[PDB]
Design a protein around this ligand. Structure first.
Ligand code: CLA
Ligand code: CLA
Ligand code: CLA
Ligand code: CLA
Ligand code: CLA
Ligand code: CLA
Ligand code: CLA
Ligand code: CLA
Ligand SMILES: CC1=C(/C=C/C(C)=C/C=C/C(C)=C/C=C/C=C(C)/C=C/C=C(C)/C=C/C2=C(C)CCCC2(C)C)C(C)(C)CCC1
Ligand SMILES: CC1=C(C/C=C(\C)CCC[C@H](C)CCC[C@H](C)CCCC(C)C)C(=O)c2ccccc2C1=O
Ligand code: SF4
Ligand code: SF4
Ligand code: SF4
Lengths: 29, 37, 139, 30, 62, 80, 161, 706, 107
């Protein structure tokens, strides 16, 4: 691969990370 | 003693001694009976 | 009442008894009059000697009091055991005999707590009591 | 190079963080 | 009405001897609920042979 | 605490009371007859849940039941 | 020849099992004294082997590529002696022991002490049930037709519903 | 009085360590929470399915990324006959220098893991060729998992909460899942094969940018509307055509040749194109159609048991059909993956089938109502439940008496120097069925060995075109299509039939007896999971409906253990060309022991000797690691609780009397594990140790030889 | 050294006469691992007649012990005070059972 594609994939993985944190904080409520 | 031999462990053993010795003596005169010939 | 102070039996021992649970909340004490100077097993380890007494013993559990209170009724026929549970760092005084008599004896004035006016095959299905605060055995 | 940073982060550091918030969430009280 | 010595079949669905034959030993001559005492050939898991039933749980197969 | 419920097929046999190791049970007079008795559990908070009261009941499928509920320090039987 | 199985009289793998079984006993015989007692027990073992290969060759068995006699249960009557014939021979014997112990228990249960007679077995009632057990394929036919071989479900005890 | 667990407030008053363990166990049991309503219940189920759906998407993006980043996918496309697929790169600080030289495998410079899932084989036939194409798939599945975790939180908001009547309306649910989810998404996958996967198998690069330009057919969609659908069945890929190039390829897109590709030993993609097309047409027309229905709709545990039964059947359906009919190019040649793929789904199918009866058993305690459910099919199966168990008690005991004695016969007889006396039953019934399907090796000569039969001829409309392709595969002994079986295969299938009958016997025991017996008539008053009813009435240990699940988990592991030992050893002679090892040695139980467990675990167990170490030393470690965790479950299984409660009551003492440690105090009073708890703890260590041990053995005994 | 110790000849029936192996010399049986051949050589035994009479000598001793168990319960059963005498029992078992037993074996 290219080295810039790895940090792009880590960047777009923050979008499920906040949403999994947002869902679990609503599922707990 | 006859009323002792009617009890379950002895009559469970001598008949099993009889039924085994039935099968033991069969395989001595009739060895290796796979099928009915 | 508990009549503390009352003389502990002549014992000196038992690692197995009355640890840190007792000082914070809920230890127990069984009090009896033993009509000899004889030896008896404890629920902790085994001996003490029962006094002439007014004998008292501070135990950790109520289960250990009724086990010792059964031994005094069995082996020595002293059925005068009277268990307690302590004050401010405890909960409830005068646990047994709760109405002045032994529980196997009938006493009028008691009320049937936990009674059911039905059999056990007449218990409802749990699907009938689903999503409700009722339980399949309470009435 | 990114393996050498990430695998002691979630192998050591990130479990030690989530163990801390859980152990406080367990033993807290209302 | 069941009398003593009558061979009954038990309709108590919770009982160990449900739909089984037993002989009534006695009936209690008062208004006590469950007065019918039936003695069974077969022991249950607590190895007893008697129980108190009502007249609604027994029949008169004789 | 564990819940202890006594059903009306009891006969006043007094056997579950004297088989209790934590002194939960007791005998009480009955309403509709005023001669026979029934067991009663006024001290269910003491119940450890050993089910020794079910081992002593002579009725077919015993008249006293023990349902193991929430576990406190008494019902866990803890010396600590 | 039902599944590519050549018969054992012309199966060369089966005829080669005999060549190696006796060669593993003749070399076991080659060291011993010829008139000795372990010598004659190996010739009794060599000839017991030859009495099972000639017993399996002439019986018309089916040997595969390994050379071992395979059995064919779909029951064909040309291969009836494998499972069908000793199976019928089994079923009478097992039903004899079955109907005897069932006839014994019905006779014992309608007595004074039934559980006592299960421990100590009444040789009158035991040999009676053997006499009632030899006739079991006939005896169960009129037993099933009479209605007293089985019981209705209002007579058996059954778990709560 | 603490807060955790929020689910059970009666667990929060528990001051022991049981509160910690039972908070983890009563966690996702949403019917047990305090204050829950059924309207609030189904919405928590719906959002949790969104959380689970994202995990499947995040997991697949991880498999796509680590092959794109740390794999050798481009190196493997050019030569799948020599290149081993790389799972991910290894970065452990605990390695040595001689170990990095031993794990720098498949010609790589870094420690890598040789993959045994075969997603290389799956993505190579979906069309992918380059490492950048896999990364774009991993990027896309991070968007779908973001779509899943957003929509789960969205459907808990008060304006977007689905109504309760929307949940319990199953009439519109089946129209849409068969229609949209099963039909259109098989019609959509039909679009992937003809546009992308078929031209990528013929040397043409079809990606997202150029697929609107190029057409799948030289006469695209002009004969779809006039009805001339037969022109899509033109000159296909011949026997000359190697996969993935224009070397003698074809232009057909929906063909029904049957059989396999002559070089990859896999299905033709034109077959899979015409397959999911017709699956789409059947599922589309099946979705235009919409006191027992009041029971299945009300009961959440009913539909869950039927789903795990439906999943558990079709999961075995995958594993049985994937090795005989390889759907993926070069998956038949990868022996280790093919072995790992059968054993994967069969162990899951056992767990799904056990959990099917488990959740039906929970329905009978919680949701079943015998006053409402009467005289239907359900309340009749309960009515003669003693007749079902006892007749399952026979066929368990009928097989196990005999197929064990058939083994002990063949053991004793083979041990006495006389192998010529074994009871070898040829499986003529199954050998008929292969001869019914066309295998002319045996010579039964009816039904598609009959060249003049009406099925092979099809005298109605001259149909039989797929039979030239099928009959050149089953008759040829180069693949695993309808394997040649003998009398050793007889004895295992009746061990298998013993296992499926016995596991059903335990599972339907506690299912039907979940509501009461003569021992405990009120077993519905105590719930699905509870230890016992004491020592009275003879003692009632393991009596509950939970503990009938618990005994059958040993039986499914043993049944799949019988199954996958038979799969592996049969193929270990098929792949090695020496079929005679399974022929003579599988008839008796010592050859099953000597020539499978002892002979094949030699190269595994030399993973690390005192002279060196190999790439199998991670498997030889995990082998022994699996033995140790399996044996630890025995400790919670054999030894029971009140030994340990009286062992902790002395460790509590020795902690309260030790100076400089008397000061440090617990908040939870330490207790032993509960009765139901360490049945689960002992079964978990048993089941993990069962599976970890075989997966280390099944991989390393096949990777050492292929 | 060369000949393996062996007893327990196996009967010529269904195939278990393959257990009667080539164990040494002109004998066929099970190679035993009980050390009785080495125990009887240290006792000095050179012929099978001395083993045959010892097998008879144990059976008459077995009947002697079995008669003594009948006698000392049914006929002449000692009282409690015969059993509570531990000092006379320790005196007798030390010098008599263990001492004379090791004195007579030293002979
Ligand atoms: C001397 C040693 C001895 C031995 C080895 C046995 C062995 C046995 N007895 Mg026992 N038993 C013994 C003495 C012995 N018994 C004596 C002295 C009595 C009093 C007469 C009994 C009374 C007895 C009864 C009532 C039963 C057994 C049974 C059994 C069998 C158990 C189940 C089975 O294996 O099938 C087993 C063979 C059971 C059995 O069914 O035997 C076949 C059984 O029901 N025994
Ligand atoms: C259990 C039942 C049983 C039965 C039906 C038989 C039946 C037989 N025995 Mg056998 N036998 C048995 C037990 C049995 N035996 C046992 C337990 C032993 C060991 C003590 C023997 C030792 C034995 C010897 C030494 C001989 C027989 C012989 C025979 C056969 C001749 C008839 C006879 O009674 O003498 C006959 C087939 C004889 C025979 O005909 O051999 C050729 C013979 O010589 N038996
Ligand atoms: C449960 C499965 C099973 C089955 C179907 C068989 C069947 C057979 N065995 Mg096998 N065997 C088994 C288990 C089984 N055995 C076990 C568990 C062992 C280890 C103990 C053996 C070890 C063994 C050996 C060493 C031999 C056999 C032999 C045989 C054959 C019997 C020959 C005979 O004379 O009987 C016919 C019996 C009669 C005609 C009499 C029937 C009436 C009897 C007395 C009723 C007894 C009821 C109690 C028969 C095919 C022999 C053989 O022929 O090899 C090919 C043989 O040499 N068996
Ligand atoms: C799964 C994650 C994980 C990772 C990435 C590591 C990594 C390591 N372990 Mg392993 N270990 C782990 C889990 C892990 N461990 C577990 C679960 C066990 C129980 C089975 C062990 C049992 C174990 C033992 C017994 C030992 C190791 C050792 C090591 C080191 C070997 C290489 C080395 O010596 O570098 C050289 C680098 C150093 C020697 C120093 C590293 C820097 C230190 C640890 C931190 C500096 C303090 C810093 C200011 C703040 C703390 C940060 C820290 C918490 C990350 C390496 C750091 C060896 C070791 O050296 O332990 C420290 C060692 O003896 N491990
Ligand atoms: C269900 C999913 C799906 C989707 C979204 C598409 C979409 C498309 N197809 Mg495809 N295709 C599909 C399934 C699908 N197809 C199936 C099931 C077949 C087999 C019958 C085909 C066989 C096919 C051919 C032969 C052609 C298309 C073509 C097309 C394109 C033009 C359609 C049009 O305007 O009329 C469009 C991108 C045409 C094209 O040129 O693609 C750019 C074209 O020639 N399709
Ligand atoms: C998609 C299908 C599905 C769904 C939605 C559910 C949902 C549920 N099940 Mg069911 N079940 C299923 C499949 C499913 N299950 C399967 C496949 C089985 C057979 C294995 C079961 C058998 C079963 C039983 C017996 C019970 C349930 C129960 C439940 C309920 C609560 C679960 C819970 O809170 O446990 C908490 C979860 C855990 C304690 C997880 C720990 C166990 C895992 C396996 C440990 C894994 C080991 C370790 C991590 C491996 C490490 C790797 C190693 C290399 C180191 C919940 C309704 C319970 C109930 O009461 O229903 C009302 C209940 O008693 N299930
Ligand atoms: C060598 C190991 C072994 C063997 C031979 C058996 C054998 C048997 N098991 Mg057992 N089982 C085992 C280990 C074993 N089990 C283990 C480790 C467990 C987990 C505790 C079980 C749990 C189990 C259950 C729950 C049941 C059996 C049953 C059976 C019987 C099945 C009928 C048959 O095959 O004939 C058979 C006797 C069944 C039975 O006896 O039905 C009548 C039955 O219901 N087994
Ligand atoms: C305790 C068992 C025991 C018995 C029954 C005997 C018996 C005998 N010994 Mg022996 N001996 C023994 C132990 C025994 N000894 C021990 C322990 C020693 C070493 C101190 C000896 C050293 C010994 C010698 C040197 C001689 C005897 C001799 C004798 C014989 C004649 C002595 C006599 O009875 O007056 C007599 C057979 C004499 C004999 O006849 O030898 C052939 C003889 O010369 N004994
Ligand atoms: C208890 C319970 C439960 C459970 C149940 C279950 C779990 C079951 C299972 C079961 C199962 C899971 C079943 C299965 C079945 C299957 C089948 C039965 C199949 C069939 C098949 C066939 C029919 C085929 C045939 C064929 C062939 C072979 C070829 C040719 C053609 C054809 C296609 C015809 C529930 C939940 C309900 C609830 C209540 C209770
Ligand atoms: C050892 C043992 C104990 C004692 C076990 C105790 C007190 C638990 C000790 C385990 C310690 C805490 C280590 C466990 C750590 C695990 C590796 C991870 C646990 C955390 C998970 C939530 C991930 C029992 O209480 C018991 C009860 C019934 C039958 C058998 C047994 C039994 O065998
Ligand atoms: S234990 Fe049950 S049956 Fe016995 S007296 Fe008490 S209530 Fe009655
Ligand atoms: S469970 Fe035990 S402590 Fe509780 S009432 Fe019954 S006998 Fe008494
Ligand atoms: S702890 Fe186990 S063995 Fe003991 S009474 Fe309960 S269920 Fe039975």
């Amino acid at each position: 691969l290219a080295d810039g594609q790895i940090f792009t994939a880590l960047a777009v993985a923050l979008v499920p990370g906040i949403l999994a944190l947002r869902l679990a904080l609503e599922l707990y409520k | 003693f006859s009323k002792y031999l009617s009890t379950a462990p002895v009559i469970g053993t001598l008949t099993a001694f009889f039924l085994a010795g039935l099968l033991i003596e069969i395989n001595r005169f009739n060895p290796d009976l796979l099928v009915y010939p | 009442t508990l009549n503390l102070n009352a003389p502990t039996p002549i014992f000196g021992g038992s690692t197995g008894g009355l640890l840190r649970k007792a000082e914070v909340e809920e230890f127990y004490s069984i009090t009896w009059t033993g009509k000899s100077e004889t030896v008896f097993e404890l629920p902790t380890g085994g001996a003490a000697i029962m006094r002439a007494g007014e004998n008292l013993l501070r135990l950790a559990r109520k289960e250990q009091c009724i086990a010792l209170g059964a031994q005094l009724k069995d082996k020595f026929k002293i059925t005068d055991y009277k268990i307690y549970r302590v004050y401010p760092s405890g909960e409830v005084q005068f646990l047994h005999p709760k109405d002045g008599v032994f529980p196997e004896k009938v006493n009028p004035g008691r009320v049937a707590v936990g009674s059911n006016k039905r059999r056990i095959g007449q218990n409802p299905d749990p699907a009938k009591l689903k999503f409700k605060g009722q339980e399949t055995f309470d009435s | 190079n990114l393996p050498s940073i990430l695998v002691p982060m979630v192998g050591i550091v990130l479990p030690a963080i989530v163990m801390a918030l859980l152990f406080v969430y367990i033993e807290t009280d209302e | 009405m069941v009398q003593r010595g009558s061979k009954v079949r038990i309709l108590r669905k919770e009982s160990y001897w449900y739909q089984e034959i037993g002989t009534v030993a006695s009936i209690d001559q008062s208004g006590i609920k469950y007065p019918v005492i039936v003695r069974f050939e077969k022991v249950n898991y607590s190895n007893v042979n008697s129980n108190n039933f009502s007249l609604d749980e027994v029949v008169e197969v004789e | 605490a564990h819940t202890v419920k006594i059903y009306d097929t009891c006969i006043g046999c007094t056997q579950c009371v004297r088989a209790c190791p934590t002194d939960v049970l007791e005998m009480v007079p009955w309403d509709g007859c005023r001669a026979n008795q029934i067991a009663s559990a006024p001290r269910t908070e003491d119940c450890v849940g050993c089910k020794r009261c079910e081992s002593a009941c002579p009725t077919d499928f015993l008249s006293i039941r023990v349902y193991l509920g929430a576990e406190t320090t008494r019902s866990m039987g803890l010396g600590y | 020849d039902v599944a590519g199985l050549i018969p054992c009289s012309q199966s060369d793998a089966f005829e080669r099992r005999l060549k190696n079984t006796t060669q593993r006993l003749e070399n076991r015989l080659k060291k011993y004294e010829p008139g000795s007692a372990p010598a004659e027990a190996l010739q009794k073992q060599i000839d017991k082997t030859q009495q099972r290969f000639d017993k399996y060759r002439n019986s018309g068995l089916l040997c595969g590529a390994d050379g071992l006699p395979h059995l064919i249960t779909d029951g064909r009557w040309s291969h009836a002696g494998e499972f069908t014939i000793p199976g019928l021979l089994f079923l009478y014997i097992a039903g004899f022991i079955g109907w005897s112990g069932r006839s014994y228990l019905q006779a014992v249960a309608a007595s004074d002490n039934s559980t006592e007679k299960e421990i100590i077995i009444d040789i009158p009632v035991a040999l009676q049930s053997v006499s009632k057990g030899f006739v079991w394929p006939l005896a169960a036919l009129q037993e099933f037709s009479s209605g007293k071989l089985t019981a209705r479900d209002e007579e058996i005890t059954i778990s709560p519903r | 009085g603490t807060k955790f667990p929020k689910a059970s407030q009666a667990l929060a008053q528990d001051p022991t360590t049981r509160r910690i363990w039972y908070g983890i166990a009563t966690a996702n049991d949403f019917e047990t929470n305090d204050g829950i309503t059924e309207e609030n219940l189904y919405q928590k189920i719906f959002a949790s399915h969104f959380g689970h759906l994202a995990i499947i998407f995040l997991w697949t993006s991880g498999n796509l990324f680590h092959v794109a980043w740390q794999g050798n996918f481009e190196q493997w496309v050019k030569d799948p006959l020599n290149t081993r697929p790389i799972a991910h790169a290894i970065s452990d600080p605990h390695f040595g220098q001689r170990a990095i030289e031993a794990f720098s495998q498949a010609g790589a410079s870094s420690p890598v893991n040789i993959s045994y899932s075969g997603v290389y084989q799956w993505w190579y036939t979906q069309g992918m060729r380059t490492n950048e194409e896999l990364y774009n798939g991993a990027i896309f599945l991070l968007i779908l998992s973001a779509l899943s975790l957003f929509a789960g939180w969205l459907h808990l908001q008060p304006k977007f909460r689905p109504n309760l009547s929307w949940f319990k309306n199953a009439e519109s649910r089946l129209n849409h899942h068969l229609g949209g989810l099963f039909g259109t998404s098989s019609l959509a996958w039909t679009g992937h094969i003809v546009h992308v996967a078929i031209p990528e198998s013929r040397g043409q690069h079809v990606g997202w940018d150029n697929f609107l330009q190029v057409a799948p057919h030289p006469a695209g969609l002009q004969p779809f509307f006039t009805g001339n659908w037969g022109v899509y069945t033109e000159n296909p890929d011949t026997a000359n055509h190697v996969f993935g190039s224009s070397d003698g390829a074809g232009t057909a897109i929906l063909t029904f040749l049957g059989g396999f590709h002559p070089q990859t030993q896999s299905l033709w993609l034109t077959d899979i194109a015409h397959h999911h097309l017709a699956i789409a047409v059947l599922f589309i027309v099946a979705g235009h159609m919409y006191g027992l229905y009041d029971t299945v709709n009300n009961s959440l545990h009913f539909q869950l048991g039927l789903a795990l039964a439906a999943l558990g059947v079709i999961t075995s359906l995958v594993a049985q059909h994937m090795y005989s009919i390889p759907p993926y190019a070069y998956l038949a040649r990868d022996f280790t993956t093919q072995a790992a793929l059968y054993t994967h789904h069969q162990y899951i199918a056992g767990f799904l089938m056990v959990g099917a009866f488990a959740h039906g058993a929970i329905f009978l305690v919680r949701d079943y109502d015998a006053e409402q459910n009467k005289n239907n099919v359900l309340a009749r199966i309960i009515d003669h439940k003693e007749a079902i168990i006892s007749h399952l008690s026979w066929v368990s005991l009928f097989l196990g008496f005999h197929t064990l004695g058939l083994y002990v016969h063949n053991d004793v007889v083979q041990a006495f120097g006389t192998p010529e006396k074994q009871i070898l039953i040829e499986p003529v019934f199954a050998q008929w069925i292969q001869s019914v399907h066309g295998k002319s090796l045996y010579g039964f000569e009816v039904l598609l060995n009959n060249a003049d039969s009406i099925t092979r001829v099809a005298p109605g409309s001259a149909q039989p075109i797929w039979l030239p392709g099928w009959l050149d595969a089953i008759n040829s002994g180069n693949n695993s299509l309808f394997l040649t079986i003998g009398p050793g295969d007889f004895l295992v299938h009746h061990a298998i039939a013993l296992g499926l009958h016995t596991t059903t016997l335990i599972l339907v025991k506690g299912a039907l007896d979940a509501r009461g017996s003569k021992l405990m008539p009120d077993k519905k008053d105590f719930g699905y999971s509870f230890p016992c009813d004491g020592p009275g009435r003879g003692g009632t240990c393991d009596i509950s409906a939970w503990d009938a699940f618990y005994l059958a988990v040993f039986w499914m592991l043993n049944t799949i253990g019988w199954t996958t030992f038979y799969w592996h050893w049969k193929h270990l002679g098929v792949w090695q060309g020496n079929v005679a090892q399974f022929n003579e040695s599988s008839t008796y139980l010592m050859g099953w022991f000597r020539d499978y467990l002892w002979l094949n675990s030699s190269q595994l167990i030399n993973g690390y000797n005192p002279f060196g170490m190999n790439n199998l030393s991670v498997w030889a470690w995990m082998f022994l690691f699996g033995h140790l965790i399996w044996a630890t479950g025995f400790m919670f299984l054999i030894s029971w609780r009140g030994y340990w409660q009286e062992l902790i009551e002395t460790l509590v003492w020795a902690h309260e009397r030790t100076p400089l440690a008397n000061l440090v105090r617990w908040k939870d009073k330490p207790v032993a594990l509960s009765i139901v708890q360490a049945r689960l703890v002992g079964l978990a260590h048993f089941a993990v140790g069962y599976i970890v041990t075989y997966a280390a053995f099944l991989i390393a005994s096949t990777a050492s030889k292929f | 050294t060369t000949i393996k110790p062996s007893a327990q000849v196996v009967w010529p029936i269904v195939g278990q006469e393959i257990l009667n192996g080539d164990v040494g010399g002109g004998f066929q049986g099970i190679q035993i691992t009980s050390g009785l051949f080495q125990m009887w050589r240290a006792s000095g035994i050179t012929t099978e007649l001395q083993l045959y009479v010892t097998a008879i000598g144990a059976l008459v001793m077995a009947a002697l012990m079995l008669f003594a168990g009948w006698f000392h319960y049914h006929k002449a059963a000692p009282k409690l005070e015969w059993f509570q005498n531990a000092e006379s029992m320790m005196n007798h078992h030390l010098g008599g059972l263990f001492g004379l037993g090791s004195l007579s074996w030293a002979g």
